[PDB]
Amino acid sequence: AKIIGGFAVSHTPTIAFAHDANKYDDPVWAPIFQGFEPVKQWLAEQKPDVTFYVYNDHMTSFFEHYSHFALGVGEEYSPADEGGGQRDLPPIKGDPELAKHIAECLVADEFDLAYWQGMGLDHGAFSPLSVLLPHEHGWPCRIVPLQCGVLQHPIPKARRFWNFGRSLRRAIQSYPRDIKVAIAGTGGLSHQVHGERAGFNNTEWDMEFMERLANDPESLLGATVTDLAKKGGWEGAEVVMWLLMRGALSPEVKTLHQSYFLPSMTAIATMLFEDQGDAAPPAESDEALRARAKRELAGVEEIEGTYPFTIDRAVKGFRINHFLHRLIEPDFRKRFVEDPEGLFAESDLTEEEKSLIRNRDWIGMIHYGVIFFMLEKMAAVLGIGNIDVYAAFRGLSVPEFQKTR
Amino acid sequence: AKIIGGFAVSHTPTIAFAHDDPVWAPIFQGFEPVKQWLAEQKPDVTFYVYNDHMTSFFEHYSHFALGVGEEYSPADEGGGQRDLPPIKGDPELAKHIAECLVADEFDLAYWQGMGLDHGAFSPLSVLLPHEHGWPCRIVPLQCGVLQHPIPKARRFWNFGRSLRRAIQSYPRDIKVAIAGTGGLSHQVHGERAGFNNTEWDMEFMERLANDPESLLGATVTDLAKKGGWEGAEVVMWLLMRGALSPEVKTLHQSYFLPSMTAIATMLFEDQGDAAPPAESDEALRARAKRELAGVEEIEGTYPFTIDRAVKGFRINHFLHRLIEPDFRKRFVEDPEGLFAESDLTEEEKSLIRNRDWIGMIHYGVIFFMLEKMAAVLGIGNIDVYAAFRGLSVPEFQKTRNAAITYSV
Ligand SMILES: O=C(O)c1cc(O)c(O)c(O)c1
Ligand SMILES: [Fe+3]
Ligand SMILES: [Fe+3]
The missing domain is CATH 1.10.700.10 (Dioxygenase LigAB, LigA subunit)
Incomplete structure (x- = not known):
């Protein structure tokens, strides 16, 4: 019922790799981990019950069958195999109920979904989570992962990602249970990891894009894949997932943190966003929305x-x-x-x-x-x-x- | 680029876990008029709507899984690969169809190399001569009707609606048929198992053909009560009828209810829209290439x-x-x-x-x-x-900027 805020963070496997190698002492990596510190601590103070976790999978658990918005409804998630075996991480827990309520509101709002369980999470998830959440026991929160099909075009339009985030707020807010929810948008920033253009970055675009995401996100909704991949690299156009998280937060937000490092292929960036609530009661009440979400299955009980x-x-x-x-x-x-x-x-x-x-x-x-x-x-x-x-x-x-x- | 009209038909597996008798003779005879319309109208491709019955799609389950692959073998459903020739898909038509759907704000899924179950292969081994291969190519739209929440009927309808102008805009004048294959009324689970309703079945078929917008308010509940739980998959039929002309011509219709499932069948012929479409089918093509336009200028x-x-x-x-x-x-x-x-x-x-x-x-x-x-x-x-x-x-x-190495 309560969205505390959202964070944005790259999901490079280098993050997972530098962490697992324990290079927190390393000249290059040290200041980069210090870049995650505000998000790590905020998450440790605010203590959200669930992180709704937008990420993409990297042709590991999604390939022969590949969907746009795939909602993890499962009770628990494990690190996936990527050719070097699963990482040394405990399974993180799900939230089938919250997943269920979000599922219902999104279909009402005419978004075609997909539901999945049992399948591992690859670097898209566990690379930054391993560094943002402590885990030498079990993870401190639950997750409702939302895996996005950003790799096989045609993919949803930028405005469609944003509008998804818009319905996503109302669903999560209308969850009649007393919980703190954070919202993660992972991926980016600039990078291209394929073809002769591999190596490409655009620090200028990265900065302009982050500032616009924070303070004028609707200014990005006209962005085509061509635009986002010209300015940011082919795989840098996965930042539409950042539009989605941003769409789930209050129209205005308090940008508490921003960090940027570009050691290698990927501009490793981090934003923290504090939600500023509702400066105006919603156009459709929490009660009305719970109605409309149940509507299609209203009554169904009375059928033996x-x-x-x-x-x-x-x-x-x-x-x-x-x-x-x-x-x-x-x-x-x-x-x-x-x-x-x-x-x-x-x-x-x-x-x-x-x-x-x-x-x-x-x-x-x-x-x-x-x-x-x-x-x-x-x-x-x-x-x-x-x-x-x-x-x-x-x-x-x-x-x-x-x-x- | 030309929709020749399409058919609605049941896809029960007993038309193959049996079939391949005097009770059957008038049932098959429900299918053979459409069968001859499929060897005479000569379709290059069949946009075939169905639902996997938890064979291919399960651990990961999608609402509109467009089949994009070049070939489909029949799925093993627990009793071996049913001896049929691999049917041909149409990736280039699938690709173009996907492009228009995304532009119209429908979230999709894409798949390749997994079997088609009885949801497809079964009723097609009746409408299609399949000696050493099949008459046409298929664009399989696997739909996700088995696990709620599922898309509203008005959403299944609009899909087919958008899907229409998407096929009309395919730049290649070939012949396309459409096949929303579902139902009809039945219920194959629970203490309610065996339910039917021939007095909704007839109301439904008649409205779908002649006043189909009068079904865009059907909830799952309204649909499940009036036709069974699994019966409510006819929401697929509204997609197919969605992709046809407003006014059609119910060429043929049959109905035989032997055992559990009410076996129906409808033959529509496409007419032609009221005046031109609101979006010219070249301006549509533009809007469908918009997202990746000029991407070739990236080196x-x-x-x-x-x-x-x-x-x-x-x-x-x-x-x-x-x-x-x-x-x-x-x-x-x-x-x-x-x-x-x-x-x-x-x-x-x-x-x-x-x-x-x-x-x-x-x-x-x-x-x-x-x-x-x-x-x-x-x-x-x-x-x-x-x-x-x-x-x-x-x-x-x-x-x-720095020299780092990494893997996995
Ligand atoms: O080599 C990288 O920096 C890199 C590799 C990845 O597989 C990836 O998804 C990414 O965002 C960055
Ligand atoms: Fe990625
Ligand atoms: Fe079915």
Whole structure:
């Protein structure tokens, strides 16, 4: 319900790399870490419950299937593998509920989304988070990551990123729970990391862009990919993600911090923004918005034997649904059938989930949070046939059931 | 550039977990008029709207996943790859369609190289003769109807609406059909399993064809009650009807409800809009190229557009697996034996073997696959950059303020 402010920070793997190598003593790296100090401490004082974390993934967890606004709805996130194995970092926790409320308001506001769980976070996330948050135990806050498809064009327009941030504020503000939320926009600034133009930077544009983002962000919304990549490098045009975070903050903000360093490929920059509230009650109240967000599923309760696959349900059901989804892999059913206890013992299903499968408990799995298309798969591995699954859903048997056609 | 009209049709899997009888004969006969309209109207491409039933799309799940790839095999749904010939996609039409949609502020997804399930392959193995291949090419719009929140019906409608002028603006006069394939009324889960409603089914089909804007207020609830929970996927039908003329001509319609799912079918013929469109289909083309216009004036830069993703897909996908520890293990130890099993052409293999960094960028490898390949190999990002710049590492490091090295 309460947005405290937002920070902007580069997401270069060099940040992760210099940290892991512990070069806080290093001539080059030392003043750069001192550049993160105001954000690190602010985050340690204000103590947000969740960081809504805008970043892009770097063809690691997103490639064969690649989406624009992909909202992490999962209960927890782990460092991804990038060819050198996962970093020595603990899993950071999610916020399925807050993710769920944001999901609902954004669809109401006509943004087409995508939801995902289980998949690691690469340097886009864990490079700066590793340096902004302490973690030799567990992370101090939760996260609702929002991974943006900025690498495969055509991608959303600059104004579309901004407008996303605009709805994002109203959703987060209308969350009827008493929490501090910060908003992160990661990536940039100037850099190009491919082709003969690799090496490119533009300190002047970087400074002009940061000042405009802070004090006149609407002046950037006419920016094309061509503009942003001419002035900032091809991969520097990922700064549209900074427009998104900026769009989620009060129209005016108190720019508490700005730092800039350009050791190597990437202009490593950092902004801290203090939210200045609402100098005017919203055009649509918090109450009205919660209405309109629930509207499409208003009533749905009053329909028996109906267990909609909402996001809470999907998160609840993710381990069982993922395991049953593995049936489409040929080798999987060559241990789901020959040796179902071995697959079980080597899996991470709670024992309750194993007994549900074991008993073929069809409507019991629908009750638990198994989607039927994961059962459709199950009934065509060991047995079984749809008429069976449909009958057990009403406790009937095949003959009595078949009497409707 | 010409929409010949399109059809709406059910996509139940029993039309293939069976099919390939006297109960069936009048059901198939519901499909064969459209079938002959598809061998007589001769479509070059079929923009085919459907939904994956949690085969291909799951752990990561999208609302409008445009298929951009050059070829689709049928998805394994738990019971093996169903013996069908790989159907052809149309990347260049997908690319152009994506460009207009983004300009109209629709957030998309793009995918390649994953199976199509019964949601596509099944009802098409009825409308399309498929001896050793298929009549046309397909642009698969996988929709995300299985996990709420999902886009409002008015949003599915506008998509199809924008999708219309986007296909009309394709500069190539070929023949395009459209196929919103869903439903009809049913419910395949819960104590409510087996529900139907032939008195909404008929009201719905008639309104969709003759007063479809009278469905833009349907909530999920209104739709789920009046037709089942899974039935409410007909919101896809509104997309297809969205992409047709306001006034159409319901050429044909069938309806047979054997078991669980109400099997419907609608044949529309496109007429032609009321006067010209408000945006000329050349000015549209301009607006759809706006974001990347003049990008060719940027030197040493190779944008990663759809055409490049399609062109780079094999070598990009192959390199992407360096994140898999057991793959990259081999890649260091047994490169050629890995190369053999892979589907990489000889040049792709050579590019990798010769560590031709500049070559891979030009060819279509996105940089972030080389960042991994560098890491896997023990060298770092810098060596790649220097190589891009035709400079030695020290000579390139000179161009930087400080000299740092890094990986992973
Ligand atoms: O080499 C870099 O500075 C660099 C490498 C990356 O993969 C990246 O995403 C980035 O923002 C910067
Ligand atoms: Fe990035
Ligand atoms: Fe369906």
